[PDB]
Amino acid sequence: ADLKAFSKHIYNAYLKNFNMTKKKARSILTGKATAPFVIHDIETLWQAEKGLVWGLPPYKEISVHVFYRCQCTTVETVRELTEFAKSIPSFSSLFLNDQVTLLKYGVHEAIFAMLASIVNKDGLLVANGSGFVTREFLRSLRKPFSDIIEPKFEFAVKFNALELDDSDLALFIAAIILCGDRPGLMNVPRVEAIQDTILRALEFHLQANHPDAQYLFPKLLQKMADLRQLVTEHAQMMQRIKKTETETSLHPLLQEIYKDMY
Amino acid sequence: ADLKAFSKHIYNAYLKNFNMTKKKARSILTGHTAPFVIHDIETLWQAEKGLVWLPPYKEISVHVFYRCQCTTVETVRELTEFAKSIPSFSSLFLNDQVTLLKYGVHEAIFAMLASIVNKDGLLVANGSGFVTREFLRSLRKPFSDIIEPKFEFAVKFNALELDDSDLALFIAAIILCGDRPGLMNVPRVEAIQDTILRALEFHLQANHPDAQYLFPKLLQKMADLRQLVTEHAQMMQRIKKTETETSLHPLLQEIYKD
Ligand SMILES: Cc1cc(SCc2[se]c(-c3ccc(C(F)(F)F)cc3)nc2C)ccc1OCC(=O)O
Ligand SMILES: Cc1cc(SCc2[se]c(-c3ccc(C(F)(F)F)cc3)nc2C)ccc1OCC(=O)O
Ligand SMILES: CCCCCCO[C@@H]1O[C@H](CO)[C@@H](O)[C@H](O)[C@H]1O
Ligand SMILES: CCCCCCO[C@@H]1O[C@H](CO)[C@@H](O)[C@H](O)[C@H]1O
Ligand SMILES: [Cl-]
Ligand SMILES: [Cl-]
Ligand SMILES: [K+]
């Protein structure tokens, strides 16, 4: 494969399928020419919900409302990641069951990697950039809901230090989805071969795009391992919430993702 | 009238994605170049040598079994693309798409098989071969027994004289089935199926104005196909149990996983 044309193709599929790019997010977070409405307590969340910014279950309390907002966010991103993946060369050539296995075990890894794009150390963009929810407000939620969000900030701030751009991330995300190690995958050799092409494209891309960045490719391989561990811990927290907070609901798609994880 | 447009869209998906139409098949089966007739070991070998066209060759009945599997896998590819070319199907989450295909493809395969079948045999290799029903009956058990019920279904199904535009809606209705195990968005699939069934109802009145009771007859055929697949799966289970030297294609393993 022509690696340069391959990478540009995945870059364009990324721009076509993800509305909020890191480029757009960073210009908002630094104030380039409407600023985001800051959500930092109940009153501003309520205002944001009325129209300042923005279906869900009936409002019971702040921590559960945020928990449901998190689920709606991730379900939307699963839709975008599905369309993105279908544009990766030879992903659509897999039988549909292997496509589902790759997305099932990969979407959260990709979500938490892309989450870093819309995050700084003080909070995250919500609602296509029109809101900003502060990290301190999220810490103020009652357990178990506060504990599940903070590790993602921790990962994101370290990941953002690598200073990837959208062209890097498009290959990185593709590599996460095209993973031959997923449980129950049918055509492992084919998935392994696609991933190798993506990784060779990524290594080549980084030489060109980050010439002075030392050890960047192996650092990104380690971040992929780090994300797998982040997702394992996240899945375990979600299952504990499902067990102890019997009155809170889990979106059916997320139940299907978390079904056979442990 | 929106149903008419909806039907035309499903018909185009069918014309775009299936390798063989019933119109094409029936013209071949009624006679440039006729299909090569496979009716015994010698003619099957000639067909494999290039006259028409897998795991290492063990014996005739198992060889045919493997060709059945290859044919099925190919049709799963086509049915996947057909369903993806239906917008309301492609809007479901991918897991529901897989559930519908997992539990629907064999029903659809056996319905479409009728298109390439007459009482004497069936077309193979994109119509360039014809394998006789008598030859398939001559294979050893368990391989002869699993094929014959499909001829019996097909001859009765072909007496309804559906054309490709009818079949496109019929197959869409089979795939968009709200009753499949593990389906996530059941009400959405149910809504799509009811739209397909209403479009089919109107299509049959337009296309078969004189055919009395044709729509309920097709609903019954859908029920019959579910039973045919139940019996087929039981026979495949017995082959997995008793023919330990015969392999099963990985995709079919996933379909039959249970
Ligand atoms: C419980 C849970 C936590 C996380 S942590 C990363 C976060 Se925080 C967040 C958010 C926060 C506040 C608001 C609001 F203030 F506006 F309400 C909106 C959005 N979005 C993401 C992606 C990810 C998934 C998840 O559950 C869904 C799943 O497992 O798929
Ligand atoms: C074992 C089995 C039987 C059937 S019966 C309907 C038939 Se017959 C046939 C065929 C016959 C002869 C030849 C050759 F003589 F030319 F070699 C080629 C093709 N194809 C189909 C679809 C369907 C599935 C199945 O197993 C696969 C599964 O269950 O998925
Ligand atoms: C498009 C036709 C695919 C038919 C085989 C589906 O097979 C299914 O794939 C799922 C993974 O997607 C598995 O969870 C499930 O156990 C398996 O039976
Ligand atoms: C595209 C994202 C799909 C994530 C949910 C996958 O969910 C899976 O769907 C399969 C049916 O296809 C089931 O066999 C399996 O049990 C379920 O875990
Ligand atoms: Cl940061
Ligand atoms: Cl089945
Ligand atoms: K017939």
Residue numbers in the entry:
A (entry chain B): 173 to 205, 208 to 228, 234 to 441
B (entry chain A): 173 to 203, 207 to 228, 235 to 439
Provide passages from the article that reported this PDB entry:
Peroxisome proliferator-activated receptors (PPARs) are nuclear transcriptional factors belonging to the ligand-activated nuclear receptor superfamily and consist of three known subtypes: PPARα, γ, and δ 1,2. Upon activation, these receptors heterodimerize with retinoid X receptor and regulate the expression of genes involved in energy utilization, cell differentiation, proliferation, mitochondrial function, glucose homeostasis, and lipid metabolism 3-5. PPARδ, also known as PPARβ, is ubiquitously expressed in murine and human tissues, being more abundant in the brain than other PPAR subtypes 8-10. PPARδ is expressed in most brain cell types, including neurons, astrocytes, and microglia 11-13, where it regulates neurogenesis, oxidative stress, neuroinflammation, as well as lipid metabolism 14-18.
Among them, the PPARδ agonist 5a containing selenazole core showed excellent agonistic effect and selectivity for PPARδ. Our synthesized PPARδ agonist 5a exhibited sub-nanomolar potency (EC50 = 0.7 nM) and excellent selectivity for hPPARδ (>14,000-fold selectivity over hPPARα and hPPARγ), demonstrating similar efficacy and better selectivity compared to GW501516 (EC50 = 1.2 nM and 250-fold selectivity over hPPARα; 1,000-fold selectivity over hPPARγ). To clearly understand the binding mode of 5a in the ligand-binding site, we determined the crystal structure of the ligand-binding domain (LBD) in the complex 5a-hPPARδ (171-441). Compound 5a binds in the ligand-binding pocket in a similar manner to GW501516 39. The acetic acid moiety forms hydrogen bonds with the side chains of H287, H413, and Y437; corresponding bond lengths are 2.8, 2.7, and 2.6 Å, respectively. A pi-sulfur interaction with a bond length of 3.9 Å was observed between the selenazole ring in 5a and the C249 side chain. Hydrophobic interactions with side chains of residues L433, T253, F246, L294, V312, and R248 stabilize the complex receptor-5a. The trifluoromethyl group in 5a establishes a weak hydrogen bond (2.9 Å) with the side chain of W228. This interaction was not observed in the co-crystal structure of the complex GW501516-hPPARδ, which showed a different rotameric conformation of the W228 indole group 39. The increased potency of 5a compared to that of GW501516 for hPPARδ is likely attributable to its additional contacts with the W228 indole ring through a hydrogen bond involving C(sp3)-F-H-C (sp2).
